[PDB]
Amino acid sequence: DFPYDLNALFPERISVLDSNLSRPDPLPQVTTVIDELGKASSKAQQLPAPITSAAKLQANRHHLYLLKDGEQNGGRGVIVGFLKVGYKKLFLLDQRGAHLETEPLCVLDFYVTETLQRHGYGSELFDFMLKHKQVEPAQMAYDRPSPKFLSFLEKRYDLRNSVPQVNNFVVFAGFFQ
Ligand SMILES: CC(=O)SCCNC(=O)CCNC(=O)[C@H](O)C(C)(C)COP(=O)(O)OP(=O)(O)OC[C@H]1O[C@@H](n2cnc3c(N)ncnc32)[C@H](O)[C@@H]1OP(=O)(O)O
């Protein structure tokens, strides 16, 4: 009968949603918060339409990491941001301009509120996945990273010298070494 509060939908600080997005049926709620966050992320960037949504997540083998700050809002919790990850099949150019058919884990979407940015939240999201997915920053690819994410990557994981591509993904020297 009574609509779930944020703490019932997402008990943990970091929540890992699947293709199966997971009193009433909670899915209509979970759906909304994913679509909202998707539009927010898509609007922060100058994107035509959202690249992240409840629908899209149901179609693909991606992982969505939700970070809920439990103290905010009287202790009901608030969603500060998310990080979406999945395996794309890519033809990347190595340092000699030869295409390499590979299928790395990629950062597909990544967003924190416009305010509350430049707090430890993005770094915590990233650090979580990395341990969960058991992977290094350098061995994974990045779908059209923004200036801020490139700043983020360089200062957190020393990722600096990007190997030239043309398919709007980004990999670093260490990706091949
Ligand atoms: C793969 C994709 O689709 S890209 C999607 C990413 N989204 C965007 O491009 C729009 C902007 N990005 C976002 O909205 C994301 O939620 C982010 C970037 C805010 C998440 O990162 P945050 O957690 O805010 O970064 P955080 O505050 O932890 O800062 C980490 C470090 O990166 C640097 N950094 C982060 N954001 C920025 C920025 N906008 N400008 C300059 N430097 C930045 C900082 O220097 C910081 O280190 P320092 O403060 O010690 O120097």
Side-chain angles (χ1 to χ4, degrees), residues 2-45 47-176:
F2 199 53
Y4 296 101
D5 63 331
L6 212 54
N7 290 339
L9 254 38
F10 306 114
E12 306 292 307
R13 179 161 185 93
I14 302 294
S15 313
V16 190
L17 287 319
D18 269 22
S19 290
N20 326 111
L21 315 182
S22 303
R23 225 160 325 165
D25 181 61
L27 194 176
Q29 286 198 242
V30 170
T31 295
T32 304
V33 74
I34 292 175
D35 297 315
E36 296 293 34
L37 281 172
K39 296 170 189 159
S41 179
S42 60
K43 185 202 175 178
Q45 321 175 51
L47 304 179
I51 61 274
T52 296
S53 77
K56 285 167 168 320
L57 181 53
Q58 295 185 36
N60 300 275
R61 273 204 134 239
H62 302 162
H63 268 178
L64 185 57
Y65 299 92
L66 279 178
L67 192 155
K68 180 203 68 185
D69 188 26
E71 278 175 312
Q72 294 186 29
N73 193 235
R76 295 171 192 78
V78 178
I79 299 291
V80 313
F82 72 95
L83 171 77
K84 190 187 66 183
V85 146
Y87 297 98
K88 260 272 189 293
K89 178 185 189 49
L90 302 181
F91 289 84
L92 295 167
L93 296 158
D94 57 36
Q95 313 188 239
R96 302 168 174 270
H99 3 239
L100 175 71
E101 192 176 345
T102 189
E103 190 180 344
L105 187 77
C106 320
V107 174
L108 296 175
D109 199 10
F110 196 5
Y111 173 84
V112 176
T113 316
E114 278 66 359
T115 81
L116 211 71
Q117 273 176 14
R118 302 207 75 159
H119 303 68
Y121 286 120
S123 310
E124 184 181 359
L125 271 169
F126 206 92
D127 189 43
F128 182 95
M129 175 254 298
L130 232 38
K131 314 201 178 176
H132 178 235
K133 236 61 192 62
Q134 265 168 353
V135 65
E136 298 283 356
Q139 54 187 264
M140 58 186 313
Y142 304 85
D143 191 17
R144 327 195 176 191
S146 81
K148 318 189 178 176
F149 191 23
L150 292 175
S151 294
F152 172 94
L153 278 172
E154 169 176 19
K155 179 221 170 184
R156 288 227 67 227
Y157 298 104
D158 192 71
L159 303 191
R160 200 165 302 93
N161 276 330
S162 177
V163 186
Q165 299 295 328
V166 301
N167 62 7
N168 294 97
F169 274 86
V170 169
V171 280
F172 294 92
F175 181 88
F176 308 90

